[PDB]
């Protein structure tokens, strides 16, 4: 199971870890991907998770988009977890660098409530441009299910823990 996580609340845990390495170790039921509406897994968490699947996540995602069209910002879809997890929950947080509404971050986190336990990154953080401190606050105030947050950046992890209210 999950090890070395710091408990933030009753249901939110956090660790400085590479979510790919965490997923390969734990093999969780659900790994969350920081997806975009097109499921184009180019960079950040998405690029890293996809590379770990040897591009199988991208091939599956392109078939999903060809059938269903793009996701909504704030939405999600459940696809295979490949070699990383049973399932991957692809969640689209708003990308502040694309001028998307930061208010959609709460809607994005609500997708986590459909799963009892998840391994996840902070939505809209990193290359999505939102303040990770704000993302962690929205996470703890929105998600009611058990979420194990993997924060890639060590310095950011220290900042998040030390500023957590």
From Swiss-Prot:
Membrane topology: Multi-pass membrane protein
Variant or mutagenesis effect after changing residue 29 to A: In strain: Mu/B.1.621
Protein's cellular compartments: Host endoplasmic reticulum membrane
Superkingdom of source: Viruses
Catalytic reaction list: Thiol-dependent hydrolysis of ester, thioester, amide, peptide and isopeptide bonds formed by the C-terminal Gly of ubiquitin (a 76-residue protein attached to proteins as an intracellular targeting signal)
Description of activity control: Inhibited in vitro by GRL-0617.
Residue ranges occupied by any Macro domain in the UniProt entry: 1-165
Purpose: Responsible for the cleavages located at the N-terminus of the replicase polyprotein. Participates together with nsp4 in the assembly of virally-induced cytoplasmic double-membrane vesicles necessary for viral replication. Antagonizes innate immune induction of type I interferon by blocking the phosphorylation, dimerization and subsequent nuclear translocation of host IRF3. Also prevents host NF-kappa-B signaling. In addition, PL-PRO possesses a deubiquitinating/deISGylating activity and processes both 'Lys-48'- and 'Lys-63'-linked polyubiquitin chains from cellular substrates.
Subunit and partners: May form homohexamers. Interacts with N protein.
Name this polypeptide is given: Papain-like protease nsp3
